[PDB]
Design a protein around this ligand. Structure first.
Ligand SMILES: [Ca+2]
Ligand SMILES: [Mg+2]
Length: 566
């Protein structure tokens, strides 16, 4: 009925630099993981144990109470396995004879509960309704999701509360089902009248005894029909009670209170409040009235069992539920940031098998650089992850003044470029509430390696950049290319052949290198020869070229003009 607590969810994201070994295609590489973690929920559950300590559980039958005492302690310890540190579970304790006794309010104190169970002692009278009423009183203060009453009895109730403004309509005759407690108690009292029907053998007063036409107390009276003002109140005839209590104010064919039915009636009020009722029958001789009364008192017949060693050992193994699902539905949107590309993602569509994906499926849109991860259901106490490799696009970073992230603190490089513009989980939580949202952390990175490209271009006589046909252009980057571009690698350690110049990540100041052309004379395929010149805008021999983690792609433009041999 009440909703359990929601399973906690948390998200994390981080970029791990690719190292030992570095990525061979591009050392500016990071493995980015997005991670969803679910925790756990124990559903709160309150239990009231109700134990029959009536005289029928003692004397000749003392193995009954002894078994209730042994099994009740076992149940307490099974449901409170960590004692006062047990999450979610509390147990209260009621005993009863001719009146109920509140032995413990709700507690996790297993030693206290077991001590009270060990002190049970047989006392005349079996006021099962009263035990159940006290359990209902105790359970009324519970705010648990699950609420259980466990009744441990030999099943023959012999006392009950008075019925207000009692009339003949508060009683009922044989149902025609020989196994109904009504029919059983009537037949039983016909066969064994002095075992069933309230009578003090010491006094001359005697009840009228029942026949097949007699009427016994109903089990479906409204709660307003019982007088609960005194929780030790009884119905008696001739100063005593019994499995049937004669009501002398009503005539032939004779009317009898039926405590087993009153207890079923009282349990119905508990069921109407949403409580689960378990009954355990300690009369192992198969007395149908007792067992069948306890079956009807329980939530259903499967919540009754006889107190055999095997049934007792197996009972109440997991009274506390744990929530199985942490996320019912989830969608992670992850926009990769400018300057970074995802390894091997060339077209839109399903990229699940191009990434490492623990759960669900991943879609990629090339134009927006957006990963959409459909998680599916994620269980509690679990983690779901996707991991993909990104590379830095050096020429894009060179050509664009990308902002740095000065707010995130997770690294790996504080103050670096974002790997993600935004990543968000939208999900349906463990109770089915949709549109829950969590924002992932923002990794930041600085490039570790740059490049220096050397270009070999044509100028005219007057030092102007030109196309091959002589038309002047605005910049050397537009001029005719005479020789394939190549890369420059300085001396010193830390650089990676063929082109990767190790960068100083601790500064934004350009690191300058002395870059020479590979050659100062170029002879083309057509036999024309070109000689190196230093002109406005062009790189001298050698020339200072600077790179940094923010501007990692330097470009030298070496100018050449035609050598004319006539
Ligand atoms: Ca008598
Ligand atoms: Mg008894």
């Amino acid at each position: 009925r009440a909703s359990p607590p929601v399973v906690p969810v948390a998200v994390d994201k981080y970029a791990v630099p690719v190292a030992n070994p570095m990525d061979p295609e591009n050392p500016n590489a990071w493995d980015v993981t997005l991670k969803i973690t679910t925790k756990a929920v124990t559903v709160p559950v309150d239990v009231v144990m109700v134990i029959d300590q009536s005289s029928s559980m003692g004397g000749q039958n003392i193995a009954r109470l002894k078994s209730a005492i042994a099994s009740g302690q076992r149940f307490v310890k099974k449901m409170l396995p960590k004692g006062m540190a047990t999450e979610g579970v509390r147990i209260a304790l009621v005993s009863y004879d001719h009146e109920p006794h509140r032995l413990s309010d709700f507690t996790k104190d297993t030693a206290f509960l077991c001590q009270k169970i060990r002190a049970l002692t047989p006392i005349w009278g079996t006021h099962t309704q009263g035990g159940l009423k006290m359990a209902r009183n105790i359970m009324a203060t519970s705010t648990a999701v699950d609420k259980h009453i466990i009744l441990m009895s030999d099943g023959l109730a012999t006392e009950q509360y008075p019925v207000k403004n009692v009339t003949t309509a508060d009683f009922i005759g044989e149902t025609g089902n020989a196994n109904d407690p009504i029919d059983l108690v009537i037949q039983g009292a016909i066969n064994f009248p002095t075992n069933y029907v309230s009578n003090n053998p010491s006094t001359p007063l005697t009840p009228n005894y029942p026949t097949h036409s007699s009427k016994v107390g109903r089990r479906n009276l409204p709660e307003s029909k019982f007088d609960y003002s005194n929780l030790s109140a009884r119905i008696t005839f001739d100063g005593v009670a019994g499995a049937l209590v004669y009501e002398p104010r009503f005539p032939h064919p004779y009317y009898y209170y039926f405590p087993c039915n009153a207890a079923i009636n009282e349990a119905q009020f508990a069921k109407n409040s949403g409580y689960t009722i378990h009954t355990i029958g300690y009369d192992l001789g198969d007395f149908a009235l007792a067992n069948n009364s306890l079956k009807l008192t329980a939530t259903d017949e499967n919540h009754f069992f006889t107190a055999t060693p095997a049934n007792l050992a197996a009972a109440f193994d997991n009274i506390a539920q744990t929530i199985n699902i942490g996320i019912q539905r989830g969608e992670v949107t992850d926009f990769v940031a400018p300057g970074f590309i995802v390894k091997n993602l060339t077209q839109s569509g399903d990229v699940t098998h191009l990434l490492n994906v623990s759960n669900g499926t991943v879609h990629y849109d090339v134009s927006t650089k957006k990963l959409t991860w459909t998680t599916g259901t994620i269980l509690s106490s679990s983690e779901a992850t996707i991991t993909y490799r990104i590379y830095a696009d050096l020429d894009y970073i060179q050509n664009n003044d990308i902002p740095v992230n000065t707010t995130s603190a997770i690294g790996p490089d504080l103050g670096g470029f974002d790997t993600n513009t935004e990543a968000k989980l939208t999900y349906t939580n463990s109770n089915g509430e949709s549109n829950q949202q969590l924002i992932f952390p923002r990794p930041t990175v600085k490039l570790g390696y740059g490049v220096i490209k050397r270009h070999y271009v044509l100028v005219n006589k007057d030092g102007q950049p030109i196309q091959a046909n002589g038309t002047v252009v605005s910049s050397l980057s537009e001029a005719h290319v005479l020789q394939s571009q190549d890369f420059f690698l300085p001396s010193g350690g830390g650089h990676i052949v063929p082109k990767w110049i190790k960068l100083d990540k601790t500064t934004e100041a350009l690191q300058y290198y002395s870059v020479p052309p590979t050659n100062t004379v170029i002879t083309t395929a057509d036999g024309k020869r070109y000689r190196f010149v230093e002109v406005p805008g062009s790189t001298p021999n050698p020339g200072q070229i600077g790179i940094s983690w923010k501007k990692p792609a330097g470009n030298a433009y070496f100018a050449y003009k035609l050598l004319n041999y006539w």
